[PDB]
Every structure is written in C-alpha cells, then in structure tokens.
C-alpha cells in the first residue's frame, strides 16, 4: 500500500501499545502484530496490525534487528511520528 506518516501521542507512564515482530535477522521488516486496546497506538487511530514500521521520528527501521528496534522504539517520548506501510 501507500507509505503513510502517522502521529502518536504518548505520556511517559505508558508504552506504545503495540506488539512488534520481525526484524532484519528474520529477513522481514519490523511489523506490528498487535495493537493493544486503549493504549496509545490504538488511540492515535492510524496504526494497524500488518503495518511495517519503516521509521520512527526520522530513524530508519528498515534494516534493524528486532532488539535494535525495541530499543529505538521504546526510547521515543511524547509526540512520536511513524512512517509505516501496509503490504
């Protein structure tokens, strides 16, 4: 599908509210496998199960290993911009 930019707003006491799977070591992008109800990703409205996370706040995630992506994603705070695509 088309590449999309999506804004997520998160408070500091919360996580992102997604599960991710995949990563470079598996030969696939970082993929959203779950959107947890009522948490920030669900609330933002623009992120879906099956989306590949291409970048977050300008950080490319296209060639990142799973745990690299976890560290990068979990470091983001506040107003967080995602670049995503559904294939």
């Amino acid at each position: 599908g088309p590449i999309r930019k999506v804004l997520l707003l998160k408070e500091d006491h919360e996580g992102l509210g997604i599960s991710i799977t995949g990563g470079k070591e598996h030969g696939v992008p970082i993929l959203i496998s779950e959107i947890h109800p009522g948490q920030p990703a669900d609330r933002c409205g623009g992120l879906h199960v099956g989306d590949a996370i291409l970048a977050v706040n300008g950080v490319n995630l296209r060639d990142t290993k799973h745990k690299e992506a976890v560290t990068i994603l979990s470091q983001q705070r506040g107003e967080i911009e995602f670049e995503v695509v559904y294939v």
Partner: peptide, 8 residues
C-alpha cells in the same frame, strides 16, 4: 513463532 515478538 520463528520470529521474535516484543510488547512495547
């Protein structure tokens, strides 16, 4: 399940 999954 071959791939890692993390809740974040």
């Amino acid at each position: 399940s071959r791939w890692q999954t993390s809740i974040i």
